[PDB]
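Dear U.,

Please find below the material for section 3 of the report. The protein was modelled together with KOI; I have listed the sequence and SMILES used, followed by the predicted complex structure.
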Amino acid sequence: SGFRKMAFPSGKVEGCMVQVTCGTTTLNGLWLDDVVYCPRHVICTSEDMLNPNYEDLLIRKSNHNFLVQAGNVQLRVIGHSMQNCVLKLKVDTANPKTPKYKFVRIQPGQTFSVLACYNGSPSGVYQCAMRPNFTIKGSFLNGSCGSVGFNIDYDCVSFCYMHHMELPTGVHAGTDLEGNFYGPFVDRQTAQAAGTDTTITVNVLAWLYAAVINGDRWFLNRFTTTLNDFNLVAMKYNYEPLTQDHVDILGPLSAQTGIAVLDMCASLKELLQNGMNGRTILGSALLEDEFTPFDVVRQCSGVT
Amino acid sequence: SGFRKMAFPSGKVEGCMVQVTCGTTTLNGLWLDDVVYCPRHVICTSEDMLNPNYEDLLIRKSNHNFLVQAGNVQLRVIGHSMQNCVLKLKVDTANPKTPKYKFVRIQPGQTFSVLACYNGSPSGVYQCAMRPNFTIKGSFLNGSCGSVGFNIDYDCVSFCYMHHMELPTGVHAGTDLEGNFYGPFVDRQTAQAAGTDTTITVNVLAWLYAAVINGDRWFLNRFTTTLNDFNLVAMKYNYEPLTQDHVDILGPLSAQTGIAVLDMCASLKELLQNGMNGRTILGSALLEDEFTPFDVVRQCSGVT
Ligand SMILES: O=C(Cc1cccc(Cl)c1)Nc1cccnc1
Ligand SMILES: O=C(Cc1cccc(Cl)c1)Nc1cccnc1
């Protein structure tokens, strides 16, 4: 009973957070095995951020310039390299708390948990989605740049995001753990605008199935639609087009509820056209799009 | 930048979760020092839940009937006692991962994080509030009954909730860690209804201050009000009456934004009377009441 925006338990990731300082810049790092990963802008002063030449700025840096502290104990840096927009600092000690892990590059629409940190210390955990414009709507302040996003499959942590930047509009940009930015963003103090933040249709449908499973059924209509008809309405409302791959992934939710995917599409089409009329679904007055179909199954089945 | 429903990092609590089984009933327990705390209904069969006499059912139970497993290793039970609606199982081993902790009984309107668990294993973490009717709107399934709610002050975990029950309406009830239910609920399979779930006014005001700090300012009006005038409108909209104690706690947010508390009350009064007109505040189409003034300060300042 009930449906919440739920994050993964963060303990396995808390055990990896470290503080990285270079000169007067401090941010967070992720310590896995004998490597600490952190945004490469740790080498920059605020002046350097205007137009940084990272390869050039890195020539002035040695292993001993990167101060890495895990808890209140200093780690010895024995190597450093730049991979895209991240630095990899080789330390002389493997993190004893390194969980089983993978580095994954997620697609827009995928959700993940963020462990927001400051000075290598966790402040909180929340659930995010990679937006269709490749920004995330997080909660980050100056100093949060070490922070990572991740998913867990039983005991394996798949790290998918490292936070680098806030856009002038207050939305967030970052990279995967190979240092490649999501979207077209660059790690420079230059104005960068985000594209259309469309609604993740397959996730809204998943959340309407979660609503039916939890008893919120008022929005179920007497209609059906087709993918093409639904998509004409999705386009008009800045929703992502729905494909047969999305219909396929919704199959288990359709099976569990007995509501055909296209019938749920027709109920969504009526909600878009009629609005909520002051009503709520799962305590929300808007259509929630940051639960994937897998998230709904996981939460509704009690996966640990 | 950004404002999210954020939970506390859960690692310190994950280190305390255990599985407790008695007969054919399995739920979660909280292992702190050499004591495991769990709902007393672990001793009941589904038939026993209709009208349980817990003292009588406990006479048929010995230490060896309580099976406690931490990870995949069994703990030896050397004592057991009932305190209100919880059992305290004394084990022969202190939990090596016991954090600094306190047991606190929270007031309605207070928020906390929940680490939802099944079979002593964490499934996820989310943020809750103790509702004014002493229910919580969680996300819990059968088997989640060990699960706890907590707050953290730097390194000390204050446990405030243990989950026991879902009401026929799908809202949740539980106890503090001394086993006293919040509200009038009893641990029995008998229909129990909840009272009015009013809106936590001081938390909505805190969230409107978070919205102004994060750039969402459209709702700021040219008016002010008084506590008595505001409360006439709060009563009409099923909002909790605002007191001078609530105004006092909002002082830091008023100081940080330069918006007098009563002016923010007048902006809230207009939102109640006019509605949102299809607009959003912090990505919500309703007024959010599960952030306390302390939560807003903590999140907006990056407390770790
Ligand atoms: O955005 C930055 C610093 C920065 C400036 C320019 C480029 C880069 Cl890569 C980083 N810090 C921050 C503040 C608030 C929330 N998230 C991040
Ligand atoms: O409510 C119960 C079992 C129960 C029945 C009657 C009394 C008591 Cl104390 C417990 N389990 C559950 C299921 C879904 C969500 N939260 C809890």
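For the text of the report, you could mention the following: The longest strand of chain B covers residues 156-166.

Regards,
Y.
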